[PDB]
Design a protein around this motif. Structure first.
Motif, PDB file in Angstrom:
ATOM      1  N   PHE A 135       0.823  -1.210   0.000  1.00 47.42           N
ATOM      2  CA  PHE A 135       0.000   0.000   0.000  1.00 47.42           C
ATOM      3  C   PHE A 135       0.858   1.261   0.000  1.00 47.42           C
ATOM      4  CE2 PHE A 135      -3.191  -3.055   0.772  1.00 47.42           C
ATOM      5  CZ  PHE A 135      -4.412  -2.471   0.478  1.00 47.42           C
ATOM      6  N   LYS A 136       1.961   1.247   0.748  1.00 48.82           N
ATOM      7  CA  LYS A 136       2.815   2.427   0.844  1.00 48.82           C
ATOM      8  C   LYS A 136       3.472   2.740  -0.495  1.00 48.82           C
ATOM      9  CE  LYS A 136       3.215   2.833   4.651  1.00 48.82           C
ATOM     10  NZ  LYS A 136       3.221   2.861   6.141  1.00 48.82           N
ATOM     11  N   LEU A 137       4.061   1.725  -1.137  1.00 50.05           N
ATOM     12  CA  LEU A 137       4.700   1.931  -2.434  1.00 50.05           C
ATOM     13  C   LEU A 137       3.686   2.351  -3.492  1.00 50.05           C
ATOM     14  CD1 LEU A 137       7.170   1.895  -4.197  1.00 50.05           C
ATOM     15  CD2 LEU A 137       6.887  -0.579  -4.522  1.00 50.05           C
ATOM     16  N   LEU A 138       2.492   1.753  -3.472  1.00 49.94           N
ATOM     17  CA  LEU A 138       1.488   2.089  -4.476  1.00 49.94           C
ATOM     18  C   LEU A 138       1.054   3.542  -4.345  1.00 49.94           C
ATOM     19  CD1 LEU A 138      -0.367   1.410  -6.807  1.00 49.94           C
ATOM     20  CD2 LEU A 138      -2.029   0.550  -5.139  1.00 49.94           C
ATOM     21  N   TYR A 139       0.726   3.968  -3.122  1.00 49.35           N
ATOM     22  CA  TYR A 139       0.344   5.358  -2.886  1.00 49.35           C
ATOM     23  C   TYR A 139       1.446   6.310  -3.326  1.00 49.35           C
ATOM     24  CZ  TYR A 139      -3.606   3.723  -0.052  1.00 49.35           C
ATOM     25  OH  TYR A 139      -4.771   3.135   0.382  1.00 49.35           O
ATOM     26  N   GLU A 140       2.702   5.944  -3.064  1.00 41.97           N
ATOM     27  CA  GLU A 140       3.828   6.746  -3.517  1.00 41.97           C
ATOM     28  C   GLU A 140       3.849   6.837  -5.039  1.00 41.97           C
ATOM     29  OE1 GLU A 140       8.610   5.934  -3.901  1.00 41.97           O
ATOM     30  OE2 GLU A 140       7.518   5.050  -2.215  1.00 41.97           O
ATOM     31  N   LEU A 141       3.616   5.712  -5.719  1.00 42.08           N
ATOM     32  CA  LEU A 141       3.621   5.705  -7.179  1.00 42.08           C
ATOM     33  C   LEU A 141       2.404   6.419  -7.750  1.00 42.08           C
ATOM     34  CD1 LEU A 141       5.542   4.584  -9.378  1.00 42.08           C
ATOM     35  CD2 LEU A 141       6.104   4.085  -6.993  1.00 42.08           C
ATOM     36  N   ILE A 142       1.262   6.336  -7.065  1.00 39.37           N
ATOM     37  CA  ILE A 142       0.085   7.089  -7.492  1.00 39.37           C
ATOM     38  C   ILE A 142       0.376   8.585  -7.499  1.00 39.37           C
ATOM     39  CG2 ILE A 142      -2.271   7.763  -6.842  1.00 39.37           C
ATOM     40  CD1 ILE A 142      -2.745   4.843  -6.044  1.00 39.37           C
ATOM     41  N   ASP A 143       1.049   9.085  -6.460  1.00 37.08           N
ATOM     42  CA  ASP A 143       1.371  10.511  -6.422  1.00 37.08           C
ATOM     43  C   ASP A 143       2.360  10.884  -7.521  1.00 37.08           C
ATOM     44  OD1 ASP A 143      -0.349  11.021  -4.291  1.00 37.08           O
ATOM     45  OD2 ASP A 143       1.206  10.620  -2.793  1.00 37.08           O
ATOM     46  N   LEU A 144       3.373  10.047  -7.757  1.00 39.03           N
ATOM     47  CA  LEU A 144       4.309  10.339  -8.837  1.00 39.03           C
ATOM     48  C   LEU A 144       3.612  10.296 -10.188  1.00 39.03           C
ATOM     49  CD1 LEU A 144       7.389   8.284  -7.559  1.00 39.03           C
ATOM     50  CD2 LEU A 144       7.073  10.790  -7.546  1.00 39.03           C
ATOM     51  N   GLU A 145       2.682   9.354 -10.359  1.00 34.61           N
ATOM     52  CA  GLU A 145       1.986   9.224 -11.632  1.00 34.61           C
ATOM     53  C   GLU A 145       1.048  10.401 -11.871  1.00 34.61           C
ATOM     54  OE1 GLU A 145       2.500   7.436 -14.134  1.00 34.61           O
ATOM     55  OE2 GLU A 145       0.700   6.667 -15.104  1.00 34.61           O
ATOM     56  N   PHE A 152      -4.879  -3.642  -9.269  1.00 39.56           N
ATOM     57  CA  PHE A 152      -3.549  -4.139  -8.943  1.00 39.56           C
ATOM     58  C   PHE A 152      -3.514  -4.708  -7.532  1.00 39.56           C
ATOM     59  CE2 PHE A 152       0.626  -3.630  -7.073  1.00 39.56           C
ATOM     60  CZ  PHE A 152       1.435  -4.244  -8.009  1.00 39.56           C
ATOM     61  N   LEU A 153      -4.136  -4.010  -6.578  1.00 45.88           N
ATOM     62  CA  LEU A 153      -4.235  -4.518  -5.212  1.00 45.88           C
ATOM     63  C   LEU A 153      -4.972  -5.851  -5.172  1.00 45.88           C
ATOM     64  CD1 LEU A 153      -4.964  -1.141  -3.473  1.00 45.88           C
ATOM     65  CD2 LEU A 153      -2.909  -2.554  -3.208  1.00 45.88           C
ATOM     66  N   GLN A 154      -6.099  -5.944  -5.882  1.00 38.21           N
ATOM     67  CA  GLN A 154      -6.842  -7.200  -5.942  1.00 38.21           C
ATOM     68  C   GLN A 154      -5.989  -8.308  -6.536  1.00 38.21           C
ATOM     69  OE1 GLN A 154     -10.373  -6.273  -8.183  1.00 38.21           O
ATOM     70  NE2 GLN A 154     -11.370  -5.191  -6.486  1.00 38.21           N
ATOM     71  N   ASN A 155      -5.150  -7.966  -7.513  1.00 36.54           N
ATOM     72  CA  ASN A 155      -4.299  -8.957  -8.149  1.00 36.54           C
ATOM     73  C   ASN A 155      -3.287  -9.531  -7.168  1.00 36.54           C
ATOM     74  OD1 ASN A 155      -3.458 -10.305 -10.592  1.00 36.54           O
ATOM     75  ND2 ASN A 155      -1.606  -9.039 -10.472  1.00 36.54           N
ATOM     76  N   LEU A 156      -2.950  -8.778  -6.125  1.00 31.99           N
ATOM     77  CA  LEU A 156      -2.037  -9.225  -5.081  1.00 31.99           C
ATOM     78  C   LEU A 156      -2.768  -9.832  -3.893  1.00 31.99           C
ATOM     79  CD1 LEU A 156       0.266  -8.389  -6.649  1.00 31.99           C
ATOM     80  CD2 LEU A 156       0.796  -6.571  -5.044  1.00 31.99           C
ATOM     81  N   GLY A 157      -4.095  -9.898  -3.945  1.00 33.24           N
ATOM     82  CA  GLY A 157      -4.888 -10.489  -2.889  1.00 33.24           C
ATOM     83  C   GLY A 157      -5.458  -9.523  -1.874  1.00 33.24           C
ATOM     84  N   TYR A 158      -5.403  -8.219  -2.133  1.00 34.96           N
ATOM     85  CA  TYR A 158      -5.859  -7.207  -1.191  1.00 34.96           C
ATOM     86  C   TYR A 158      -7.103  -6.507  -1.726  1.00 34.96           C
ATOM     87  CZ  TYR A 158      -1.035  -7.901   0.407  1.00 34.96           C
ATOM     88  OH  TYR A 158       0.150  -8.455   0.840  1.00 34.96           O
ATOM     89  N   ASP A 159      -7.711  -5.698  -0.868  1.00 38.94           N
ATOM     90  CA  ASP A 159      -8.926  -4.973  -1.209  1.00 38.94           C
ATOM     91  C   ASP A 159      -8.588  -3.563  -1.669  1.00 38.94           C
ATOM     92  OD1 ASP A 159     -10.660  -7.085  -0.562  1.00 38.94           O
ATOM     93  OD2 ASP A 159     -10.652  -6.523   1.562  1.00 38.94           O
ATOM     94  N   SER A 160      -9.335  -3.083  -2.655  1.00 28.16           N
ATOM     95  CA  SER A 160      -9.172  -1.715  -3.126  1.00 28.16           C
ATOM     96  C   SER A 160      -9.820  -0.752  -2.138  1.00 28.16           C
ATOM     97  CB  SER A 160      -9.836  -1.551  -4.489  1.00 28.16           C
ATOM     98  OG  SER A 160      -9.813  -0.197  -4.903  1.00 28.16           O
ATOM     99  N   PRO A 161      -9.101   0.266  -1.668  1.00 25.94           N
ATOM    100  CA  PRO A 161      -9.719   1.308  -0.838  1.00 25.94           C
ATOM    101  C   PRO A 161     -10.286   2.484  -1.619  1.00 25.94           C
ATOM    102  CG  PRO A 161      -7.362   1.635  -0.902  1.00 25.94           C
ATOM    103  CD  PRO A 161      -7.639   0.428  -1.763  1.00 25.94           C
ATOM    104  N   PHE A 162     -10.145   2.501  -2.938  1.00 28.64           N
ATOM    105  CA  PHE A 162     -10.466   3.692  -3.710  1.00 28.64           C
ATOM    106  C   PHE A 162     -11.971   3.841  -3.909  1.00 28.64           C
ATOM    107  CE2 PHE A 162      -6.275   2.150  -5.246  1.00 28.64           C
ATOM    108  CZ  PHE A 162      -5.516   3.131  -4.639  1.00 28.64           C
ATOM    109  N   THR A 163     -12.420   5.097  -3.933  1.00 32.51           N
ATOM    110  CA  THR A 163     -13.827   5.432  -4.105  1.00 32.51           C
ATOM    111  C   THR A 163     -14.227   5.346  -5.576  1.00 32.51           C
ATOM    112  OG1 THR A 163     -13.265   7.797  -4.185  1.00 32.51           O
ATOM    113  CG2 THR A 163     -13.952   6.893  -2.052  1.00 32.51           C
TER     114      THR A 163
END
Ligand SMILES: [Ca+2]
Ligand SMILES: [Ca+2]
Lengths: 313, 318
Positions: free
Chosen positions: A246-256, A284-295
């Motif tokens: 989650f931390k790396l993804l959020y970081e990459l979301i901001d860079l993107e 991508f989160l679901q693909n790793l087995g996690y839940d999406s928090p996005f609205t």
């Protein structure tokens, strides 16, 4: 002292070549055994990726010349820049990221599946070049390369991920590998999807769909292998890995977001491409087995764009 | 009088991604530029290797079953062992040796050509597996894997080359990579060609020729890049590299002779396969720009074998 005769005892008595090399040149080396596939998912994936082989010269991009010539120089520049930036991501995957997954593999068959991934993403980069050969001028091509090296918001997305490919932590390396085809792809793919919805560049769109067909599998397979290793970790180590993702993804979301705003500023596409990108972060989160928090509003995609996932122009 | 008066400057202001990692995460990264190919040989090789893509489904291996059934259990075992030993070499190339050449590359395009080489040699290994699935029993396959891991003369050939792939010396790594498709292949390829010259396993030899078509280019290209880099080095370093090549090749030849004698010992093929091997050692040296020191007697190949080796490879398309 076993009372059952276990088949293929040689496998536990030997090491793959990469394991021999990594562990100080120790052990008896075994050949890959394509007649005893340890994980049937590896055979399924090998078969699909090899049946999906293609090359860009199979598509007549020259039939797009009249459509290309209806686009203003500003739109042609945007396409050349966007695609050259994707070519940079392809180059990183082919020469660093996918090849770094070879030693991280759970099975011998996975080791060579990642060599296919590396080669095919090199074909993706080749196909961008092929499109430019047919449609773009020399000046357009060179200016896009100079823009790629000099655009800091573009460079920073790559710089954030490359350090994980040392395999200091194999699971972090695999996450950083999957973020290329599973996330950074989509901010750029918004543009050809938008052009396709408007009936532009139909033959180039065929190449984009062949690239997408490969990338979807690359992301899926890395997520499959991520989940398989992570499920064997302690609950504590699994929590640490989930917080890393989650931390790396959020970081990459901001860079993107910063990159796409710069790329699409003059055209108004940035807000739409960002929602499209964040939607694919959720997958991508679901693909790793996690839940999406996005609205929903964070991830809203118009239907003409959303279907391709499977007056003002 | 007269009026007093640089393309692609970005290239010199940037680095490739593998360099960026090499330099300690320093520099601006450039995308590969397929529209400005620094060495046209790279475009030629990319075009050749990709147009030569194949998969084992191309060959009707089941049509070899009638001739396979005429071979004794001992010959079938020899074939399975020889091919599984070749699959080990393929595995080393696909996962270690070819991958290791990526950062040794002189150009961006060469970096990805070696990713094609690694994948295609993985296809070579998968093709042996296809042959085994069609012809061999599960017991024969497993026996051959157990023999591969336990046969020291086989293992020693791989153990002699793998340490160079760490790239402490990129030219030594490249020589040690090229020795796999350019030399160690041939002692094993002697067997299918010997058999098909006698009308046995003809479809299997079609697989072998598709493998050979790729392996020849892998060896040629490594030798081309080796020569290009060596030619810019000091006379002292060039002579050091020549001595290294001859020393390593001769040591590999000795290891290969020991292995082929053990492999072929009950069949009488070792002396012939060794001459076939040493013939290809001479060609290996020529491919790095050196002269072969081997005699006609050390390198004799019978015409029926040469016919199988040299035959061209081929509505199924990819
Ligand atoms: Ca908008
Ligand atoms: Ca003899």
């Amino acid at each position: 002292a076993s009372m059952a005769k276990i088949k293929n005892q040689y496998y536990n008595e030997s090491v793959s070549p990469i394991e021999y090399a990594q562990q100080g040149f120790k052990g008896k080396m075994r050949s890959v055994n394509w007649n005893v596939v340890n994980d049937e998912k590896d055979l399924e994936v090998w078969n699909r990726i090899t049946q999906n082989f293609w090359l860009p010269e199979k598509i007549p991009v020259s039939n797009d010349l009249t459509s290309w010539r209806t686009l203003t120089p500003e739109w042609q520049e945007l396409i050349t820049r966007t695609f050259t930036g994707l070519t940079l991501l392809d180059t990183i995957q082919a020469t660093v990221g996918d090849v770094a997954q070879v030693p991280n593999s759970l099975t011998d068959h996975e080791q060579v599946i990642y060599t296919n991934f590396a080669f095919m993403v090199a074909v993706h980069a080749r196909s961008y070049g092929s499109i430019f050969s047919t449609l773009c001028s020399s000046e357009q091509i060179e200016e896009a390369h100079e823009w790629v090296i000099n655009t800091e918001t573009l460079q920073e997305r790559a710089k954030a991920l490359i350090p994980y490919y040392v395999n200091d932590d194999p699971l972090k390396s695999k996450v950083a590998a999957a973020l290329m085809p599973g996330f950074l792809l989509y901010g750029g793919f918004y543009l050809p999807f938008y052009l396709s919805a408007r009936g532009k560049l139909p033959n180039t769109s065929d190449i984009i769909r062949l690239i997408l067909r490969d990338k979807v599998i690359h992301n899926y397979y890395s997520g499959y292998k991520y989940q398989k290793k992570v499920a064997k970790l302690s609950p504590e180590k699994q929590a640490e890995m989930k917080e890393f993702v989650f931390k790396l993804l959020y970081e990459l979301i901001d860079l993107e977001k910063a990159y796409l705003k710069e790329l699409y500023e003059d055209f108004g596409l940035a807000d739409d491409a960002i929602r499209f990108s964040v939607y694919n972060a959720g997958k991508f989160l679901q693909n790793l087995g996690y839940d999406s928090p996005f609205t929903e509003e964070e991830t809203r995609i118009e239907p003409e764009i959303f279907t391709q996932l499977s007056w003002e122009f």
